[PDB]
Ligand binder design. Structure first.
Ligand SMILES: COc1ccc(C[C@H](NC(=O)O[C@H]2CCO[C@H]3OC[C@H](O)[C@H]32)[C@H](O)CN(CC(C)C)S(=O)(=O)c2ccc(N)cc2)cc1
Lengths: 99, 99
């Protein structure tokens, strides 16, 4: 659907068997989720935002259903204040900006 | 225009007589720009992101031209890593998400 920006663009996602709410974030290259348990193996990583850096765990090729659209890609898990769907997955569900 | 997200959605802006590049950021409530000289009077403020918090100067009713669309609103100035156009201004230039 089209989404306007008067409110935070939140969507329901299903990942790792669990249901969550996440922000569609054009200002994020990567997808970053709050602490949650995801099955596979991972690789430590450091990502930088507005207030500095956080350590996250990088999971590759994770299935995510974003507003009922399926995508597979990298998901980062760590102490982000909010679940963020980044451009890496936005492209996969055909998400675009319009003005 | 319609913008895809295979790359960072960067646009050219004009503010305070100066030309800058800024990221269209659906994940940001407010607009935040790197240290620059802005004429107005300002109020101290504190904003939080992924790695913690930064102190910014809040300027109200600042004119901004974003890809040739004019908007007037609050602009925050401080040590952000990148110039961010947030939802407060995105709504004014009629910007939407689409998928
Ligand atoms: C490294 O350079 C940057 C680049 C972009 C950003 C923007 C944020 N996204 C962000 O934190 O992205 C992180 C994690 C996701 O992947 C990466 O994408 C680019 C960036 O390297 C890194 C996001 O879009 C908005 N943020 C908020 C989200 C966490 C919900 S905010 O900037 O902290 C921000 C906070 C309060 C206000 N009022 C205004 C902005 C910040 C700093």
């Amino acid at each position: 659907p089209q989404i306007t920006l008067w409110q935070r663009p939140l969507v329901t996602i299903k990942i790792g068997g669990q249901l969550k709410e996440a922000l569609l974030n054009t200002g994020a290259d990567d997808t970053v989720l709050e602490e949650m348990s995801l099955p596979g193996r991972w690789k430590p990583k450091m990502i930088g935002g507005i207030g500095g850096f956080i350590k996250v765990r990088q999971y590759d090729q994770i299935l995510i259903e974003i507003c009922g659209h399926k995508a597979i890609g990298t998901v980062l898990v760590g102490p982000t204040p909010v679940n963020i769907i980044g451009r890496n997955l936005l492209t996969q569900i055909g998400c675009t900006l319009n003005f």
